[PDB]
Amino acid sequence: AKDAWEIPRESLRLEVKLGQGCFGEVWMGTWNGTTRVAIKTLAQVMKKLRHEKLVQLYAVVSEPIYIVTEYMSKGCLLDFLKGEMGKYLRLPQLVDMAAQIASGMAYVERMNYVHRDLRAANILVGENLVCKVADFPIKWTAPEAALYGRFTIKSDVWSFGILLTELTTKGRVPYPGMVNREVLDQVERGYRMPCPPECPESLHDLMCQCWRKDPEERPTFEYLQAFLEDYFTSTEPQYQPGENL
Numbered sequence: 001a002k003d004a005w006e007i008p009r010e011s012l013r014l015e016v017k018l019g020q021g022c023f024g025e026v027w028m029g030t031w032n033g034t035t036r037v038a039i040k041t042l043a044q045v046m047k048k049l050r051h052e053k054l055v056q057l058y059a060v061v062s063e064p065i066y067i068v069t070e071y072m073s074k075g076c077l078l079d080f081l082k083g084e085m086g087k088y089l090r091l092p093q094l095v096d097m098a099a100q101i102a103s104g105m106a107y108v109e110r111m112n113y114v115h116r117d118l119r120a121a122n123i124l125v126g127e128n129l130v131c132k133v134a135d136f137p138i139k140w141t142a143p144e145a146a147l148y149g150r151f152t153i154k155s156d157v158w159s160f161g162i163l164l165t166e167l168t169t170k171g172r173v174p175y176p177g178m179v180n181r182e183v184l185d186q187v188e189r190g191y192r193m194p195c196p197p198e199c200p201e202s203l204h205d206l207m208c209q210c211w212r213k214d215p216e217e218r219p220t221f222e223y224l225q226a227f228l229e230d231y232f233t234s235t236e237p238q239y240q241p242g243e244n245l
C-alpha cells in the first residue's frame, strides 16, 4: 500500500540514459508532460531528508521500480572536475562547491543521518555551479568503517576530507599509485596524503583535521560549512590566483 510520494509509471516519459550503474541506470526524462526529471531504474531516506544542498526527491514507483528526482543539468561532480569546464575552476569556485556540500552534510548531521559514500561521484552539479549531495572501495572510507563497519557522521567527515583532495586536484583519484591494501596499511600507520600543488596550508590542515585517527576529534560539518563559507575573509584574505588554484 502506497504513500503520497507514489505515482503511476504512465506519468513518466524516459528519454536519455546517464547512466548505468551497478544496481541500476539513471535516465533523463519528463514527468506529467511539463517537468524535466531524473529517474533511477533498477528513497525512504530521501523522503525524510529535505534540504537545498541535497538532491530533491519528486516521486517513486513500486517492479520496475523508479525513483524520480530533480534534474541536475551539469551532471556528476567527478566528471565536471575531470572535464572541459575546469580547466578553469580555481580555489574560490572549488571552496564554494565545498561549502555547499558541507552545508548539505551539516543538515544530514543535524538530522542524525549518515551518508556512507560521500565522494565527488555522488555530488551532482546544476545551474550556477550549485552542488547537491546524492546517492546515499575504500580510498574514501574512514579506517574504522572500512575495517569494523563503524559508519557515523565522523566517517562522513573523513570522506569529506578526501572529497577536498578531489576538489583541489580537479578530480584525481586519491592516493595515486596506491592500491587499496597499501592505502589501508599506510593510513593505519598514520600516513596522510600531502598538501596538493598550490593548495594553501590552511586548507590542507583542514583536510588533516578530517583525517584524525580518532573519529571524535574530526570537526563537525557545521564547523566545516562555516570555515569554508568564510574562507577568503577569515582564513586566506591575501589569497592570489596561481596557475591551477
Ligand SMILES: */C(=C\C(=O)Nc1ccc2ncnc(Nc3cccc(Br)c3)c2c1)CN(C)C
Residues within 6 Å of the ligand: 018, 019, 026, 037, 038, 039, 040, 055, 067, 068, 069, 070, 071, 072, 073, 074, 075, 076, 078, 079, 121, 122, 124, 134, 135, 136
Ligand atoms: C555522472 C553520473 C550521473 O549521475 N549523472 C547524472 C546526471 C544528472 C542527474 N540528475 C539527477 N539525478 C541524478 N541521479 C539520481 C537519480 C535518481 C536518484 C538519485 Br539518489 C540520483 C543524475 C545523475 C557519471 N559519473 C561516472 C559519476
